[PDB]
Design a protein around this ligand. Sequence first.
Ligand SMILES: Cc1cc2nc3c(=O)[nH]c(=O)nc-3n(C[C@H](O)[C@H](O)[C@H](O)COP(=O)(O)OP(=O)(O)OC[C@H]3O[C@@H](n4cnc5c(N)ncnc54)[C@H](O)[C@@H]3O)c2cc1C
Ligand SMILES: Cc1cc2nc3c(=O)[nH]c(=O)nc-3n(C[C@H](O)[C@H](O)[C@H](O)COP(=O)(O)OP(=O)(O)OC[C@H]3O[C@@H](n4cnc5c(N)ncnc54)[C@H](O)[C@@H]3O)c2cc1C
Lengths: 450, 450
Amino acid sequence: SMKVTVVGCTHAGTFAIKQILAEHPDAEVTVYERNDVISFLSCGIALYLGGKVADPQGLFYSSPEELQKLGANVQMNHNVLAIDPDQKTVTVEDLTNHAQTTESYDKLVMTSGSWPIVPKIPGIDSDRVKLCKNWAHAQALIEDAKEAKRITVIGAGYIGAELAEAYSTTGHDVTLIDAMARVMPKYFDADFTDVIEQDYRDHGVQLALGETVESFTDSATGLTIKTDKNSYETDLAILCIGFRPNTDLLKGKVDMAPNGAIITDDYMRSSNPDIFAAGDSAAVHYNPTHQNAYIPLATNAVRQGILVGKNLVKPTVKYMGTQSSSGLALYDRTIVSTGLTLAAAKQQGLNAEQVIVEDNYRPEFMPSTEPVLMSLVFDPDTHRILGGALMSKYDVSQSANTLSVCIQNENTIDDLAMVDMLFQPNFDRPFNYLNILAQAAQAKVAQSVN
Amino acid sequence: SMKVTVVGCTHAGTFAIKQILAEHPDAEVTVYERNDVISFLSCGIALYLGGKVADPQGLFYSSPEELQKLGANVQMNHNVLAIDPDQKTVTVEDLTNHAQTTESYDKLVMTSGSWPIVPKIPGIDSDRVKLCKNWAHAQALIEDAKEAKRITVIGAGYIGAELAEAYSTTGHDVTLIDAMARVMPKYFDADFTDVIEQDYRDHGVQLALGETVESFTDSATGLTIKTDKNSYETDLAILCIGFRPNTDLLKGKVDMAPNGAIITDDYMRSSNPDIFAAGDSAAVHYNPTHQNAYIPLATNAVRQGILVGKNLVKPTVKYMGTQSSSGLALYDRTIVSTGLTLAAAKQQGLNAEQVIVEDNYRPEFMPSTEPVLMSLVFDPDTHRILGGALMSKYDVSQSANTLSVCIQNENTIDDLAMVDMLFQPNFDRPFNYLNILAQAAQAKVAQSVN
Ligand SMILES: Cc1cc2nc3c(=O)[nH]c(=O)nc-3n(C[C@H](O)[C@H](O)[C@H](O)COP(=O)(O)OP(=O)(O)OC[C@H]3O[C@@H](n4cnc5c(N)ncnc54)[C@H](O)[C@@H]3O)c2cc1C
Ligand SMILES: Cc1cc2nc3c(=O)[nH]c(=O)nc-3n(C[C@H](O)[C@H](O)[C@H](O)COP(=O)(O)OP(=O)(O)OC[C@H]3O[C@@H](n4cnc5c(N)ncnc54)[C@H](O)[C@@H]3O)c2cc1C
């Protein structure tokens, strides 16, 4: 029977194994995972530290026992040491006793995920510097936070943004450091990040943007972080400066993006047709640019993992690409986005323009309403929508998914300006705020012809 | 100068006039309207009677003074008595002094809307039987509600359902009478309306479904309503049994649906190329069936009004059709839908199947979560989505707009099962509930092929 080896099992491996067992019940599925746990939702780390999680056992949706019950050979606490594609073998180490074995496979599923970026900064190995990815990192931060009054987050991505907000609302002195000029520049344009950065300042968070960390120096009174512009002392530092594909097992053996992300076809097959990749270990087709990108999100992991099971024997279901749709909740604001920002679109030489619209999402005669700040990025010549974002105290998260479907179908600002959307004052004005947003883009395009 | 006559001005006429004046500033636009007010939002009637509207003056978004300021010859309190499309002339009556005039036009915009259906039932002319459409009807119900403990709603569509809910939550004894079997069967299937009808019973509303009103008889202690199965005494009866296109001015002169709705091309031109129709006076292109239908919603009126302005001279912007996307709030429940129900699809002999899913909309480890009941109607052959509905105490209204864009682009259950949507525990599971909905539809299709 067909032998399948799965390297790594958090989200992409979990969905791949379940899919393979469901559609090929005769296949021999062996899975190796360094940790003793699977299906951990890292998105809940900041939610717990922020107080919002009572039972940490709810942060798991699967288990090694469940995959075993489904018919999988589950080998937890195993570290894959080598992958031999020409001999189609794999060498694995049992971390409980160093026992090494060499096994054959017919298909290999590379779901080894990613690992945080740790730069060559002097003193970064300090015990007051912590990572924040897996369940082990979470349990450490859970116990270490009660004593760390001063928290410093290094890296102003969405993960770093969530940690700073979660620690600020729980009685900590928070400093947010990043070398980039703005917070979360991949998701939102300057109009959005200006409001968010003001929210951090209003809540006492010290913003140290545009500064590069140079050294970590430990003393009795805490950890001293020196940047090219200032110096800070903290009780704990957390690294949130991005992720790197954990694919060195296949380096030089399958085609890769410069950062190590495995390049796949539309059926999740690598350059080696017997090695599949899914999740943080792989690149994704970015629909707005029709090129590969590294977008390490759980949405890609669960989707690509399913496709691995669909296409294990032969191509069956094509990958639909992604728009990198994301959403965040910070200081009672819902901040969502999808596709390209204006900055990213121009940074990549695309013909793009932007409209910014602020409106109450539902009529004022209602008992309450709330302003929603909206952005729409579009090609001024083809009118094709390239991206969009919404920010409001009202939960506007589902509108980003509406925009994602628009971009998936390559709809224009003219499609969105008039497409049928419901009206009821409990929810919106006669035209939905997404219609109003696209009508503003039309007016900006019209203001150009005349 | 091009002379334009607009017959009727609530929503479709308001948007048409503003659009015509903006894109043809040198048009002579003359508008006649029986009422002395424009742009009244009839959806606010039930919202006020439910205590959700402090100032009823805010239920307007434009005014005759505004249209005149924009350049239009605004003739309020005028009743158009005749239209001659051959000679391109109109005959109007000034309702303030009975004065009649006769004017010519180059183009005529027929935005005469609709009027409630009044059946030939004995006693229905009683002063205790009230209509519920325009601002004059609203003021009467606002003043009568104080003296009407017992309210009887006739017609269990969305309008009557909202009135019954509004009165019942404000201390009124409510009876909901209708001859059809379910409430709002044009929007929702039985799984949804069973829960809705149960909410009415839990809140003390007397559901008189499957009953046919036979007479209204005034008595000493109010109004006696006799049906074929029961007898009711009430203080106020409100007719909510549907709407008829108010188009008798053009009967036999332009092509019409059997109910009188004016049939237009994709540019809102009637069979007479110089007469446009928009709003409740017209039939709409229904995308799920690709046929003309009568769907009197404010969403269609504001859209088709805009298209009249853009297509006044020559065809410029095509009509995108509609999905009849709608949404309501009944007893803290957000209930939204778009496209075909399974009942309506089978009633028209369409190859259609349905899947029903109930799930918590976001993970259980969050501080709170809420169940959402979901429906997806699809063609089991082509996999094309025909319609969908969602119901939850959490505001899921935006998801119906996502399904509308899906139907607009003729996406399949396979497209929706895997299309990129954001994940963050504040909003959804790793797969958005819309993804999960379409994945269950794939499962139903899969269990039939094997
Ligand atoms: C704090 C945090 C918050 C996040 N929030 C969100 C969010 O809100 N929304 C969203 O969409 N995404 C979010 N993400 C990203 C999301 O968690 C990742 O995309 C997801 O973990 C990727 O799934 P994966 O299984 O492909 O990768 P991984 O989770 O990294 O799984 C890889 C596994 O492979 C194992 N492994 C690696 N090498 C070997 C080897 N030689 N032998 C054996 N095992 C090996 C590793 O032990 C690891 O467990 C967040 C991430 C973090 C860190
Ligand atoms: C209680 C109620 C609640 C509703 N709730 C919603 C909702 O929540 N969401 C939604 O999308 N839709 C809703 N609707 C429907 C929506 O209000 C209508 O579709 C909308 O009014 C249609 O706009 P219209 O201008 O085309 O038609 P109309 O509102 O009927 O306007 C027609 C105008 O033309 C005038 N007129 C007619 N004949 C003549 C004549 N010979 N001479 C001069 N003037 C004339 C009339 O006086 C009238 O003012 C609701 C309707 C009602 C009645």
